[PDB]
Amino acid sequence: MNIFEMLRIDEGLRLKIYKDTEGYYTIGIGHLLTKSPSLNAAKSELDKAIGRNCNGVITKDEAEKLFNQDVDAAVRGILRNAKLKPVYDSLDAVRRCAAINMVFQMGETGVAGFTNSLRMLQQKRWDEAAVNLAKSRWYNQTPNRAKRVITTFRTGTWDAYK
Ligand SMILES: [Cl-]
């Protein structure tokens, strides 16, 4: 397993614009287009991102390139963030995937709000961090996704995805 396979399982793949769990226009492998309610705004963001007139539909190859760019951006955001980088650098490779997964879903600023959980992860207090991570709007709104990510942090294995 690697980060790309993990996020593909969690996000799925759709080649036409869809709405995510919060109602936001999305395409591909979980690529957020806009939080605006305007479908026309979402279509314009899509054309800008892809470089052609898509009319709301992309190819599998385009979805995979957007996805690679999004994962790279998530990693780079962690490495540039003074609060996230020291935690990330303290984690083993499997747990680093769980960290990227959270940033991909909620953004750099959303994860940075998990201050208490991040300190427990840095201290390798896995069971305590798992309980603390579950006491969140994240867990209450997307519990199956959150359970898989939390189990990955807790165990350092891919067992939740196998
Ligand atoms: Cl879920």
From Swiss-Prot:
Keywords attached to this Swiss-Prot or TrEMBL record, sorted alphabetically, are:
Antimicrobial, Bacteriolytic enzyme, Cytolysis, Glycosidase, Host cell lysis by virus, Host cytoplasm, Hydrolase, Viral release from host cell
UniProt pH dependence: Optimum pH is 7.3.
**Coiled-coil residue spans:** none
Q: Return the broad EC class.
A: hydrolase
Report the outcome of E11 to A/F/H/M/N: Complete loss of enzymatic activity
Q: Which reaction does it catalyse?
A: Hydrolysis of (1->4)-beta-linkages between N-acetylmuramic acid and N-acetyl-D-glucosamine residues in a peptidoglycan and between N-acetyl-D-glucosamine residues in chitodextrins
A single MF term (Gene Ontology): lysozyme activity
Q: Which GO terms describe its cellular component?
A: host cell cytoplasm
Q: What is this enzyme's EC?
A: 3.2.1.17
Q: What does this protein do?
A: Endolysin with lysozyme activity that degrades host peptidoglycans and participates with the holin and spanin proteins in the sequential events which lead to the programmed host cell lysis releasing the mature viral particles. Once the holin has permeabilized the host cell membrane, the endolysin can reach the periplasm and break down the peptidoglycan layer.
What this protein is called in its record is Endolysin
Organism the protein comes from:
Enterobacteria phage T4 (Bacteriophage T4)
- What is the phylogenetic placement of the source species in the record? Viruses, Duplodnaviria, Heunggongvirae, Uroviricota, Caudoviricetes
Q: Which gene encodes it?
A: E
